Design a protein around this ligand. Structure first.
Ligand code: ADP
Ligand code: ADP
Ligand code: ADP
Ligand code: MG
Ligand code: MG
Ligand code: MG
Lengths: 375, 57, 26, 57, 375, 375
């Protein structure tokens, strides 16, 4: 299927795995990060004895399979799910073995050392891979953006990373990760819908309402004013049609769901909102480059697909920062895949072909030394 | 009658055994607090002694 | 920064899937 | 029947609370042993520290 | 009958209504939450034309009246039953009108807004009440416990609420309700008794077996070991005498009925057992106070009247949590009425007499504004 | 409680307030410099309506109260916290009014004029105090040391001051302050522990790890060699038991945390390490007295309680300076309180009783003139 000896770019982002060959502009195999395990034991004869579903095979059946998240906040919980999702991506979709081409994986900023050593060991010992490389997502996203300056805000599913890069220079001391993202928003919407009257307590419905949020939920331009005008609703409340057919009616809750990002007090945490944390990060940077960080801020992550985030960011930053300079916020189209796109354009360089880590040096050095070599 | 007598005896047993249990519980907290304080100061003393020994060297 | 479009599906596979036996020269 | 119910519940209470009391007794003994050990170690550490301080002076 | 102008504490808990005047230590009017409706039409002359039985009047006759539950999982199904049970409690037992004293009602945590607005409207418009107040059950139970710290586990009849309160501080974000309680246990016992051989499919028998469970069913200290030793039964199986006289023989099923709480997989639901859900809730809290939540856990609800719950909780939590700290579980005597008791001691304070909601401000504001004022 | 008309020595050092009467050898009221503010709003009735916790009352509850630092780098951020901490120290611990005795406060070197004018105004206008006096910490520390020559290195919590004093002579031109101290070390340890695998993002955990550092973290005698020998750890890594019970395992990170002081490049700042800055300061002094500054260097600040600082300073200075002379470094026991001790011995002199500033002259002159009179 592939006639070019190039690394397979597999972005294992929290919530959605995006795998594809280098050189492509979009991932071909896109599936959620979920593992379905048979809950009961059947006396039936003939069905697949497979004890571990994955991807679309699990999405197609969520009532029988108990759903487990292979990644939580960033820390890898179960490694069997890791081996399952890579083995599946290798021998069920791409139809190619890892013994013929490299593999450029993308990991989140500020992750545990155990996670890195574990994935590297599974990719070297178990699977025969000629060479591995771990890369931070923020750099590849800035590559795909086509710039060298700005602060990347990557909001995945269970973690949110703010990474400032000015003139290409990474700042490992200022990268601050906060576990507020799509899962805590799904939980907030679920508890407020339970407050509305429709109560559910199973994961399949949780994924359904997550999809409903992805499709409908947006960000408000003025929270309190929308609350007041929605008190007497007319066009502000919408009636959604569940894929099963049950008629759901959702009004203001939509534009109050992502608001939890701006007010973490809703989930009883002393952490500051994403905008205030980004602002504090900007103060932690130097003054000289602060204006450039204001003018080149970039966004990444699937959570940014909601309509109305750019305007909300502009008003909040204008209210926090002075209103004398110019603070333009740029969001490139299809930003979610941009990271992966970067991977593709990063795997075609010959120099990058010279910066890989082969098996033998890793085996003698050991995983810890490999951690030192990368950084 | 027989059942009521047995139940009354059991109730008296509850009162006395629970009272002793409450006493033992109070003793637990007291003993635990003293043990923790003693271990804390013992670790402190050991660290200072090792450091002053290094300084003597 | 440029790239080659990937929705440009390969003609051979596309020609087979659209025609069947009619695709012989392409 | 109510008296029999009370008697059965009371018997179970006796077994569980007696187990609790015995566990508390073993825990008190263990705590006293640990306290004595910690106190002796602290005394020894203090004596050695005094000796080392004299030598240091 | 009453010479003190004090609020009537009416705990409308699922399964049992407990009504009484403030200041008392126990509810005087205790009756199940059931409504009996004439099934057939009689040509007889002279009997009461009353078309809606309630309480003991319905309990005394369960063969003629089709039984309907006025509350399901928490959501109020029928409001006519609501009006029936309050009108009955007012003009058949207490022998007092609501136009002379307040009324402190107790509602379950995380209930629908429709339920609250409906009950408040029936208590203001229809009935002339000088003042109303909705209160969560967990706070009053913690009051009656005589503490300010701990996690209250309230297991009613159709819903189970875990509510953490440390130092008197409520946590509305961590309260998670799960509809596993006495009704699902009655259903499990019924289907397993149908498996034993005695098959029934009517509600009167369901209430009878519910009473049998309340009287006999207990919690096991070791499920599998009791299963093994009960395989050859001697004193492990008991012969119960039905109030009608039929000799029933019940063995292990007893201590396997509440076990469904610890293994929801028996009812084919992905939800976790009550102990595991409580443990997860403890992780959702902060680490600093987790030890205090371990040392001050409190229980509430009629379902907790079974013998052997405290020990089972201790072993399960010890197996789940470390065994280095101290994890004492406290269950106050007569915990079921404790909630109601709290109500009594809450209605005697002058400050609480200042926190009531009078008719006029509710009428101008409307019910929704009243919801904002309470929380 | 006090029968002597003597000034109250209140050292308001960054991180720890140490208050006590003059003549004593140690502060009686020692509490951290933190302010806890109620985060949520409770519907509960009976708890203290106090809207501003302070000191041990805040330390006892860090999960409910959002923690704010009343001092940052040296510049006073919020003055309400200032009024809170003094009013608390006056009317909750010392049990004495400031209207009967003077008050000798200690401020950090090279502080803003706004800070001084503000504290003086709060101590004269609001509170009725017969007389105030601002004093630099370095002089009092040199007093407590019992000498007149040397360079005092005061490392507080958010600022580090190097102050050379030879033969009692202050050098206001050479005092250079650098905002590297315990907070930046706590941040470095936190980010490296997040790199280890245990990720936290709340202030309570930050204070906990700060305490863990104070208890365990030490300075290395040879950084690279310890890194090499710790690569294969045995006794070099230690397993600490969190006060909550979670088993933490910390190895080399300990003696790499304070190393950030010697290598500010870790936090991406062009500033030089504390030792190199002190060395540069010594070159800025005159050559004649440089040897005496080498032989009489003194240390101050709580941060100096770590074991191994004296030896590290000796090796670094020996590597930087010639190895022909004698460079003895002296650290008096209980140096942290020594400053406060100085205050005590400074408030007993009759001449110092003649160098106070009464209300009337300040009122006519105004605060700015008071600044001129002191210096
Ligand atoms: N099309 C979409 N619309 C709205 N939200 C989305 C969409 N796709 C993903 N998300 C959200 O983004 C999160 C996953 O993001 P992720 O795939 O990790 O981004 P990235 O791959 O850029 O790291 C989930 O919480 C999900 O709710
Ligand atoms: N005496 C009892 N023994 C055992 N179970 C009981 C008893 N009383 C009530 N229950 C159970 O408790 C449930 C009802 O609890 P509820 O009255 O709602 O508690 P609360 O009033 O504390 O909320 C029912 O499912 C019932 O089976
Ligand atoms: N016993 C101790 N051990 C280690 N470090 C300490 C100790 N006490 C205080 N510190 C550190 O010192 C800093 C506060 O110092 P500070 O109280 O301002 O000193 P001073 O009062 O001499 O100015 C904090 O960053 C804290 O981490
Ligand atoms: Mg992302
Ligand atoms: Mg209950
Ligand atoms: Mg200091």
């Amino acid at each position: 299927d592939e006639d070019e000896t190039t690394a397979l770019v597999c972005d294992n982002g929290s919530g959605l795995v995006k795998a594809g060959f280098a050189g492509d502009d979009a991932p071909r195999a896109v599936f959620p990060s979920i593992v379905g395990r048979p809950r009961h034991q059947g006396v039936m004869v003939g069905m697949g004895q497979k004890d571990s579903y994955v991807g679309d095979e699990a999405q197609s059946k969520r009532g029988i399979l108990t759903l487990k998240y292979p990644i939580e906040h960033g820390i890898i919980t179960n490694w069997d799910d890791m081996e399952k999702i890579w083995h599946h991506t290798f021998y069920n979709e791409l139809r190619v073995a890892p013994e013929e081409h490299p593999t450029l994986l993308t990991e989140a900023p500020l992750n545990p050392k155990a996670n890195r050593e574990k994935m590297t060991q599974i990719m070297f010992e178990t699977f025969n891979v000629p060479a591995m490389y771990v890369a931070i997502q923020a750099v590849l996203s800035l590559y795909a953006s086509g710039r060298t300056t700005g602060i990347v805000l990557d909001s995945g599913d269970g973690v949110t990373h703010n990474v400032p890069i000015y003139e290409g220079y990474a700042l490992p001391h200022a990268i601050m990760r906060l576990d507020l993202a799509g899962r805590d928003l799904t939980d907030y919407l679920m508890k407020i819908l339970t407050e509305r009257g429709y109560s559910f307590v199973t994961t399949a419905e949780r994924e359904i309402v997550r999809d409903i949020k992805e499709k409908l939920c947006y960000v408000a331009l003025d929270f309190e004013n929308e609350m007041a005008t929605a008190a007497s609703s007319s066009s502000l409340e919408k009636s959604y049609e569940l894929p099963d057919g049950q008629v759901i009616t959702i009004g203001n809750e939509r534009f109050r769901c992502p608001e939890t990002l701006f007010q973490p007090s809703f989930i009883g945490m002393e952490s500051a909102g994403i905008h205030e944390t980004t602002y504090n990060s900007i103060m932690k940077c130097d003054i000289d480059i602060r204006k450039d960080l204001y003018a080149n801020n970039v966004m990444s992550g699937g959570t940014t697909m909601y309509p109305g985030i750019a305007d909300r960011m502009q008003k909040e930053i204008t209210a926090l920062a002075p209103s004398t300079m110019k603070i333009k916020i740029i969001a490139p189209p299809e930003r979610k895949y941009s990271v992966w796109i970067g991977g593709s354009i990063l795997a075609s360089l010959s120099t990058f072909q010279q910066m890989w880590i082969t098996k033998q040096e890793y085996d003698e050095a050991g995983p810890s030394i490999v951690h030192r070599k990368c950084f | 009658e027989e059942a009521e007598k047995a139940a009354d005896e059991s109730e008296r047993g509850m009162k006395v055994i629970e009272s002793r249990a409450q006493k033992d519980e109070e003793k637990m907290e007291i003993q635990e607090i003293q043990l923790k304080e003693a271990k804390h100061i013992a670790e402190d003393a050991d660290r200072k002694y090792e450091e002053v020994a290094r300084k003597l060297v | 920064r440029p790239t080659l479009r990937r929705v440009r599906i390969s003609a051979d596979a596309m020609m087979q899937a659209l025609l069947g036996a009619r695709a012989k020269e392409s």
